[PDB]
Ligand SMILES: [Ca+2]
Ligand SMILES: [Ca+2]
C-alpha cells in the first residue's frame with residue numbers, strides 16, 4: 001500500500017482520464033477529481049486485470065479518449081474498463097529503436113499532435129497526427145528540458161505546464177518559456 005504523503009514518494013506514472021487524474025504506484029492508482037479534497041486509491045486490476053502489475057508510463061489521447069499504457073516492450077490502449085482489440089501491441093509499431101526496452105514516462109500535447117515518450121536518458125517525439133517519429137530525435141533529457149535532471153519517472157500536462165517528476169520531486173515546467181516555474185515534493189499532486 002502506497003502512502004499518500006510519504007515525503008519519499010515517487011510515482012510510476014500519471015495520465016488524465018476524461019478530466020480525472022490517475023496516478024499509478026505499484027499495483028495501485030489514485031484517482032483525482034476537479035475540486036480540492038478527496039483522493040481514492042483502487043487496485044489497477046480491480047479495473048483492468050489484463051494489465052501488468054506494474055505501469056511504466058501512461059498518456060491520454062484526447063481525440064480518441066484513449067489511455068495508452070506502457071510496460072516493458074508492450075503497450076495497451078484502453079477505453080473505459082475495456083482494452084481495445086489488437087492489444088497489447090509492441091513498442092515497435094511506435095518506431096522506437098531496439099536498444100530501447102523500457103519507457104519511463106509519457107505525455108501527449110494536444111497543441112501539436114506530438115507525443116513525448118522518455119526512455120532512460122533521452123526523449124523521442126512521436127507525431128500522433130501522422131504516426132511518425134520527429135526525426136530530429138532522440139535528444140537528451142538534459143539538452144531539451146534543462147534543469148529537471150537526466151531522468152523522468154512520470155509526466156503530465158495540466159494546462160500550460162508540463163509536470164516532470166524526478167524521484168521524490170515535481171517540476172512545473174513551461175513548455176513556452178522552457179524554464180522551471182516551480183519545484184515541489186512529488187506527493188503534493190495528492191495534497192500533502
Ligand atoms: Ca514511470
Ligand atoms: Ca503521462
Ligand SMILES: [Cl-]
Nearest residue numbers: 015059060107
Ligand atoms: Cl498525459
Ligand SMILES: [Cl-]
Nearest residue numbers: 014058106155
Ligand atoms: Cl507518465
